[PDB]
Amino acid sequence: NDWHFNIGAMYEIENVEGYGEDMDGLAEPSVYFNAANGPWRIALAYYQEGPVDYSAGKRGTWFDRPELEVHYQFLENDDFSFGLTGGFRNYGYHYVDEPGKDTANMQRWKIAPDWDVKLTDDLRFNGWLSMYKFANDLNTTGYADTRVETETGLQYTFNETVALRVNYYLERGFNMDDSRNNGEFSTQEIRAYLPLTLGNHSVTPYTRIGLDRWSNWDWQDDIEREGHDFNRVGLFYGYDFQNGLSVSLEYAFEWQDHDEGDSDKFHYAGVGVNYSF
Ligand SMILES: CCCCCCCCO[C@@H]1O[C@H](CO)[C@@H](O)[C@H](O)[C@H]1O
Ligand SMILES: CCCCCCCCO[C@@H]1O[C@H](CO)[C@@H](O)[C@H](O)[C@H]1O
Ligand SMILES: CCCCCCCCO[C@@H]1O[C@H](CO)[C@@H](O)[C@H](O)[C@H]1O
Ligand SMILES: CCCCCCCCO[C@@H]1O[C@H](CO)[C@@H](O)[C@H](O)[C@H]1O
Ligand SMILES: CCCCCCCCO[C@@H]1O[C@H](CO)[C@@H](O)[C@H](O)[C@H]1O
Ligand SMILES: CCCCCCCCO[C@@H]1O[C@H](CO)[C@@H](O)[C@H](O)[C@H]1O
Ligand SMILES: CCCCCCCCO[C@@H]1O[C@H](CO)[C@@H](O)[C@H](O)[C@H]1O
Ligand SMILES: CCCCCCCCO[C@@H]1O[C@H](CO)[C@@H](O)[C@H](O)[C@H]1O
Ligand SMILES: CCCCCCCCCCCC[N+](C)(C)[O-]
Ligand SMILES: OC[C@H]1O[C@@H](O)[C@H](O)[C@@H](O)[C@@H]1O
């Protein structure tokens, strides 16, 4: 048909309390492009994660992450939309003072059906399920070869200005390859959002309530990545000029109730820009 394209840049931040120092902030630059015809979406992304910049470069384990995906929109229509994504991703780890470690490259393969089913003129049952295989350098990297993920639930529309999404979120890492044991975990949350849609402004308060969560790792005392889920309240802002230029702001406070002397607390901040054409 016609072709559509986007390009954008997002910069995110993730902190931990207190003052302190617990050590001491992540930074997540990233850029994307997508296109754009028909039931076909082509996407590529570049992401990178590491400690808060200050680079001599005396950094700390960081990692970069090319991404490519293609999405096929089988059926779209007000009754029952259905869709699919295959994805490939590469984690390019660079360890900095982790004895026994220099560098890793683990791949992730992704198969994610998605859906939007009408229930009434005010209720929808939308969602995505996502199946992954992770490939090389697992021992080094700690991932677990297989992982399921899904966020699905109900949307109710008060009117063109206010909506309510309440979802079940589930994330299981497990190993298909007995015997490997590394990165096994399970997360369950309820997620609730109230997308406010005020002309060009867009605000969404939201929250994640953990149902049950267990891991194999970050407690006493392992380093941090995927995944990695916390109770949070957050708010997302978004503005569309109709240029084709949008920007966004998001902030979220996350906690973990504990039995130590008190409890671990996190901050997320996140600005984006997107341009359509
Ligand atoms: C893909 C590129 C998106 C924009 C990159 C983020 C721009 C800011 O880069 C920033 O340098 C500054 C040091 O004062 C700080 O504000 C940030 O912590 C640092 O990462
Ligand atoms: C990644 C997007 C590819 C777009 C190709 C379909 C046509 C849209 O843009 C196209 O660029 C092509 C060369 O790049 C030419 O064949 C077309 O004449 C030009 O219109
Ligand atoms: C720009 C739109 C033209 C369609 C691009 C080629 C695909 C047309 O063919 C489609 O592909 C599907 C596989 O994804 C199959 O279910 C069927 O062969 C068909 O519906
Ligand atoms: C045969 C080894 C790879 C050859 C290059 C292209 C074929 C890759 O095909 C497969 O993609 C799968 C995605 O689900 C992965 O699980 C596998 O690691 C891979 O072998
Ligand atoms: C995301 C918002 C959650 C509320 C929507 C689902 C509430 C579950 O309630 C259900 O709703 C159906 C629609 O009338 C009723 O017909 C069912 O009998 C009832 O069990
Ligand atoms: C509208 C939002 C729906 C919330 C549903 C909460 C209960 C979900 O059902 C869940 O199915 C899981 C499959 O992994 C089981 O393992 C869990 O025991 C069960 O709680
Ligand atoms: C994972 C790194 C942070 C990116 C967060 C994107 C915006 C806020 O996270 C939420 O995720 C949902 C996924 O189903 C989106 O549908 C919501 O609109 C969005 O508010
Ligand atoms: C995606 C590309 C981003 C380029 C952004 C360049 C603009 C720099 O952003 C700066 O914001 C500050 C607010 O604290 C103001 O004080 C400055 O006037 C402004 O230049
Ligand atoms: C189960 C229904 C729950 C309603 C959904 C509202 C979730 C948003 C959380 C609000 C936090 C934002 N606030 C109010 C502090 O500004
Ligand atoms: O569509 C929302 C997307 O969010 C991402 O964070 C998930 O990893 C994808 O599987 C999902 O499709």
Curated annotation (Swiss-Prot):
InterPro entries to which the protein is assigned, alphabetical: Bact_OM_Channel_sf, Outer_membrane_porin_G
One GO biological process term: carbohydrate transmembrane transport
Subcellular localization: Cell outer membrane
Pfam families recorded: Porin_OmpG
Alphabetized UniProt keyword annotations: Cell outer membrane, Ion transport, Membrane, Porin, Signal, Transmembrane, Transmembrane beta strand, Transport
Membrane topology category: Multi-pass membrane protein
Chain ranges passing through the membrane: 3-11, 23-33, 40-48, 65-74, 80-88, 105-112, 125-134, 148-158, 162-171, 177-185, 189-198, 206-214, 216-224, 230-241, 245-255, 265-276
Function text: Forms channels functionally larger than those of classical porins. May act as a regulator of the RCS-phosphorelay signal transduction pathway.
GO MF, any single term: maltose transporting porin activity
Top-level taxonomy: Bacteria, Pseudomonadati, Pseudomonadota, Gammaproteobacteria, Enterobacterales
Main location: membrane
UniProt-recorded name of the protein: Outer membrane porin G
Record's subunit section: Monomer.
Gene3D superfamilies attached to this UniProt entry: monomeric porin ompg
GO CC annotation, single: cell outer membrane
Highest taxon, organism lineage: Bacteria
